[PDB]
């Protein structure tokens, strides 16, 4: 995107409500000009 490499991924978090259920989050990270990642 915008001629830059990004990594997009889905993560799962376990939550007690008892009963077990899950929370989901999407994360996005990218390469900076010096080669490090954000």
């Amino acid at each position: 995107y915008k001629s830059r490499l990004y990594l997009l991924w889905l993560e799962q978090k376990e939550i007690t409500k008892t009963e077990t259920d899950y929370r989901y989050e999407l994360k996005l990270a990218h390469i900076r000009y010096d080669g490090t990642w954000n």
Binding site: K2, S3, R4, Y33
Partner: protein
């Protein structure tokens, strides 16, 4: 400010990223220095000679 609008940020770096994929020779070029940014809200440009 009253009737004036002052740009506070820049989008240059975002457009630079794509140009930058070819290296320094592009980054520091005159073409790069001619990147345009969006106008500050409703309005228009005009020439007065």
């Amino acid at each position: 400010w009253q009737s004036y609008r002052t740009r506070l940020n820049t989008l240059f770096a975002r457009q630079l990223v794509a140009r930058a994929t070819t290296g320094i020779d592009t980054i520091l070029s005159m073409e790069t220095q001619n990147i345009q940014e969006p106008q500050l809200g409703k309005g228009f440009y005009a020439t007065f000679v």
